[PDB]
C-alpha cells in the first residue's frame, strides 16, 4: 500500500521524533510513505480560516494537488492539518463554483485541483487499513502505563462530515492505545478542548493555558502517567504550556506528552534516539 | 457616571441587514433558524472562563449588529472545538458563522499582531511554525534530513505559495510589505 | 355492514371507545397485548392539572369494560391478520399462552407468593421486580396471573399452592377469528429511551431517571411504596433537577416534534415531590413552558408560587457524574446570559413520546399510513382527526399523536361515533 | 394594507399573548391558538409580499400540536420571520403614523425600540357575548376562565353535570379546529 | 487578557439562599413567581440609558446571587417610577 505523507509544521519543525517514529512504524507495517515535495502549512485553520477562507482553501488545495500528482491519498497525523485538508477537500469536491475559483487562483502556479484523492487521519488508517490484530502482533515491549488520551477537537468533529467515531464517547484511540498494553484512564471532561485551536493560543495565551490547566488538573486527579495525543498542535500546547503554567502560576504537573506514534514506537521497541525525546520540554 | 445613551439601547442605526444577508449567503444561512436554547453556550469551554457567549454572537448575527460583532474581542475566544455544533438541536453551523464573522472582522482591521506574525511566517517560509536551528540539529541526529521535504527545501514551492497569497490578497490583508519583507 | 367493532389497545382511549360503542348497542371486541388493560394512565400516580389520583378514576372504567355484556375482552393477545374492507373485516388474533386458566384463576396471588424466580415487572418500567408468575398490579382487569416462560423453571410450587387448579403449564397459543365492520386503533405510545443522549448519561449515571420511572416511584403502589429514593443508596434526594425536551424538538436525533405533555407532567411530578418532601430543592431546565390546556397556565403559576419550584430557561449542555455520584448539570441560564454548573442528588429526564414497539407490524397488517412524526396519519388534519383514508378504520388517543388524557378521551368518543355511523346505516 | 393610507406595510410586528397570561386584566390563562395563527399569518404575509419584514414578540412559542413544531421551524428557515423573546412594554405612534415597539430583547438582555409600518395584536379568545344568559337559561356552571365547565376534567370532557347537556368545541375552552371537531364527535 | 475564572460561571459558591429567603420574608414574596417576560426592563426609563436591568435584578434575587446584587452600582439607578410594577403580567 502507498499513501502520500503530509508533515505539516509543528511535527517536522519542533518535534521530529513523532515523524521518525511514524516513518519507522509505517516501514514495519509495509506501507510506503511517499513524501509530498514542496508541501507547506496546511495552512493552520485557526489563523488562516479565521482571516480569509479563500486563501486557506487555496493553500490547502495546492497541498492536495501535490498528492493528486502522485495519485495517492494523503495521510496526516495532525488533527489541525487533517481538519484543514479534509474540509478543503470536501468543500471543493461538493461545490463547483468554489472549485472553479480555487482553480483560477491555482492556475498561475501551474496546478489544478481535480478532487481525485482522499484525506485520511493517521489513527483512522491504523485502525482500518492495519487493524488491531496486526498492530498487536508487532508489540514486543508491552507497556505498563496509565495514559490520558486526548482526542483533540478536529479528529472527530464535525462528525457529520468526518464520520469516524462518536465525538461524545469515542473508543478508537483508546483501543489503539490499549493494544500496546497501556491503560486508557477515564478523567473528567475528557473530550474537552486543549485551548490551542482557533488561533486562541497566539491571540490570548492565558485563555488557552487555562484550558490546558483545567485539562491537566482533571488528568492528575485520575492519576495518569502520561498524555497521549494525535495532534502536534495539541502536543505543543500541552508540552510548552506546562512550562508556561509553571512559570506563570508555579503549578507543577510533570506529565509527559507523547504522540500516538511515539507510544506505538515505545511498545514496538524502537531505538530510544528515534523517539527524539530531547525535543520535548517536559522530561519523559 | 453610569450614563451612556448609545450602549444600552438598540435602534435601526445599530443594525446592518446587508451584513446578515452576506453572512447567510456565504454559508451561514442556518443561523436563521436558531431558537436560542443556549445549548452552545453551556457546551462552550471558552464561555466558562471569558465573556464570550456564542449564543449571543448567533443572535447578533441574525439581528444584524455588525459593529457589535466584528469589533468584539470575545469573537476571538472560540477555539473551533465544534462542541456546540455537535449538540445544537437546530443543527446550526455555529463554527461556520463564527469563522465568517472573523473574516468580516479581519477585513475591518481587527487582526491581532500575533496572527499577522503567523501569516508573515507562512508568507516568508511557507510554514506557520518555521524550523529553528536546534530542530535542524535534532533532525540531523536522528537520521532525518536537515530540512523537511517542504517549502523549506524547495524554493519553487515557496514561490508558488507566495503567488497564491498574492492572488488572494492575503498579503495586503495583514499588511505585508514585500519590498522590506515586514508588516 | 357488520354491526361489530374491534378496538385495538386497552388504554384509556381504547377503554373509552369500547365502552361508548358497547353502550350504543354494538357488540365490540377489545384486543390488548398486555395481560391487563389500563395503558399508561394506570401507571401514573396523579394527573395534571388537578393532581387527582389516576387509578381512582380509571379503575371503575376498567371494571365496566371487564363486566360489559357487549364487550369481549381478549388480553395478552395480538392482531395477526386483517383482511377485507369496511363492514366486512376478517381479523385473525392470536391469544398468547398465559399458562394460567383465565376462567379458573381468581387472582388471589398465592402462586406469586410461592414462586422462587424473580424477574422485572413491565408495569414498573424497569425499576420494579415480581416473580416468574405475576399479576401486573392489584387493580388488573382481568385479575388473573401470568407465567413468563423466559424465567419459569417449572418447579411446580404454583401448581401445589393453587386451590382453583388454574395453573396450566401445557397451554398453547390460541387462534381466534372474528368478523367486524369497523376497527379503532388505540395502541398508545412508548416513552422515549434517552440512552442515545450520551451527554446526559442515562444508563451510565446511577441517579439519572426518566419521567415515567419517577411516576412509578412516586406511585404509592410502586416498587418503592411511593417514596422518591436515589437509586444509588436508597435515600431521599435533597436536590432534584428536571430536564425538558429530552427526545423532542431535537434534530440531532431526528425528533423535530413536540411531545406535548412533558412540560405538564414534569411540573406535576415536581409538585408531588415538593408535597411529599417540602425541603427538597427542585429545578426545571426548559426551553418553552407549553402550558396551553385548560388550567395549565394556572398550574404553572402554582408551581412557581405555592411550591417554589425553580425554572431555568436553558437547554442543558451536559450532565456530569461526580465521584460521590451527585450530578452536575452544566447549562446556560439564557436569561442571566451565563453558564451555570449546579449540583443535584437526582436528575429526571423529561422524555418524550414515541410510537409503541411493534407499531410498524400492526400498521402494515391493517394497511395504514403514518405521519411524519411516525404516528398514524388521519384522513384530514383539520376536519377528520379520527378517520383514516382506509374506510372503516379509525384512530383514538396517542396512536394519532402525543396528547393528554382528555384529548385522547374526546378522540375515542368521536371515533366511536364515526364508526357507529356506518354500522347504524348498515350498508 | 395599512389602515392609514391604503398602502402595503414594509415592516410588520406581531405581539403575542394580548389579552392572555396577564393578571393585570384578570386573564391568567393561555388562549392556545394565538401563537400558531400569528405564525401562520406571518407566513401568509411573507407569501403574498416577500419583501416584507415580519417580527414576532413572544414569551413562549407554544407549538405543541401535530406538525406545529415543524411549522414553527419553517417560519424561520423558509420565510425568514424574526422572533424576539420579549413582551413589549409599549407601542408609540410616531408623527408619520409609524409605530415604535419598545420592548426588551431578553436573550440579548437589552432594550430595543424598533419601527414598524403595522402592528398586529395576538388577541386571545374569550367567551362569546351573551354567554352568561344562555348559561343561566340552560343551568350550566362555568370554569375559572369563564368558559363552560365539563363534568370531569380528565374522563368526561364533553359531558356536563346537567344530564342530557353536552359541550363541543371552544364552548368548553380555547382550542384549534381538530380538537373542536373531535369534541363535537364525542359529544354526538 | 479576557481570562476571568470566577466572573463567567455560576456555582453554589456564588449563591446565598438565606439572602433570597430574607428578601422574600421581608415583603418580596412575589419575586418567586416572575416568568422573566422582560416587560419591566422594556418599561424602565433608566434601563435604556444605563446598564441597569430590573428583570436581571429580579432573577438574581430569586437565584440568590447576593454579592452580585448588593455590590452592583446599577442597583441605584432605579427612580422608583413604578412603571414596571404597573405593567407586570405576574403582579410582581
Ligand atoms: C410520564 C407521563 C406522565 C403523564 N401524565 C399525564 C397527566 O398527568 N395527565 C394527562 O392527562 N396525561 C398525562 N400523560 C399522557 C397520557 O399518558 C396519555 O395521554 C394517555 O396515556 C394516552 O392513552 P392511550 O390509550 O391513547 O394510550 P396508552 O396509555 O399508551 O395505551 C395504549 C394501549 O394499547 C396497548 N397496545 C399497544 N400496542 C398494541 C398492539 N399492537 N395490540 C394491542 N394493544 C396494543 C398498550 O399496551 C396499552 O394497553 C402522561 C404521560 C407520561 C409519559
Ligand atoms: S445550540 Fe443551536 S439552537 Fe441553541 S442557541 Fe446555540 S445555535 Fe441556537
Ligand atoms: S466551537 Fe467555539 S463556540 Fe463552539 S463550543 Fe467550541 S469554543 Fe465554544
Ligand atoms: S393461578 Fe391459582 S394460585 Fe395463582 S392467582 Fe390464579 S387461582 Fe390464585
Ligand atoms: S413453575 Fe414457574 S411460575 Fe410456577 S413457581 Fe415455579 S418458576 Fe414460578
Ligand atoms: S411539551 Fe414542553 S417539555 Fe415536552 S417537548 Fe414540548 S416543549 Fe419540550
Ligand atoms: S398560545 Fe402563545 S400567544 Fe396564545 S396565549 Fe398561549 S403563549 Fe400567548
Ligand atoms: S414584568 Fe414581572 S414577570 Fe415580567 S420580567 Fe418583570 S417582574 Fe418578571
Ligand atoms: S421603578 Fe421605574 S426605574 Fe425602577 S425598575 Fe421599575 S421602571 Fe425602572
Numbering used by the authors:
A (entry chain B): 1 to 284
B (entry chain C): 2 to 184
C (entry chain a): 150 to 576
D (entry chain A): 378 to 565
E (entry chain c): 2 to 93
Reproduce passages from the article:
To further characterize the Elp–Hdr complex, we performed cryo-EM analysis of the 1-MDa fraction. We obtained structures of the ElpABC–HdrABC complex at resolutions reaching 2.2 Å. Cryogenic electron microscopy (cryo-EM) structures of the Elp–Hdr complex show that Elp interacts with and can transfer electrons to Hdr. The architecture of the electron-donor arm, containing ElpABC, is similar to that observed for homologous subunits of the FdhAB–MvhD within the Fdh–Hdr–Fmd supercomplex. As predicted from the sequence, ElpA is a truncated form of FdhA and does not bind a molybdopterin cofactor. In ElpB, a hydride is transferred from F420H2 to FAD, and electrons are then transferred from the FAD down a chain of iron–sulfur clusters, eventually reaching the bifurcating FAD in HdrA. ElpC has an identical role to its homologue MvhD in structures of Mvh–Hdr and Fdh–Hdr–Fmd complexes. Cofactors including the electron-bifurcating FAD of HdrA and the CoM-S-S-CoB-reducing non-cubane [4Fe–4S] clusters of HdrB show conserved architecture and coordination. These conserved structural features strongly indicate that Elp subunits functionally replace Mvh subunits under Ni2+ limitation by providing electrons from F420H2 for the FBEB reaction that drives reduction of both CO2 and CoM-S-S-CoB.
In the methanogenic pathway from CO2 and H2 studied under laboratory conditions, low-potential electrons for CO2 reduction are generated by a flavin-based electron-bifurcation reaction catalysed by heterodisulfide reductase (Hdr) complexed with the associated [NiFe]-hydrogenase (Mvh). Here we report that under nickel-limiting conditions, in Methanothermobacter marburgensis, F420-dependent electron-donating proteins (Elp) are produced and form a complex with Hdr. The Elp–Hdr complex uses F420H2 for the Hdr reaction, fully substituting Mvh as an electron donor module for FBEB at lower nickel concentrations (<50 nM), at which Mvh production is not detected. The Elp–Hdr complex forms a supercomplex with Fmd or Fwd to perform electron-bifurcating CO2 reduction using F420H2 as an electron donor.
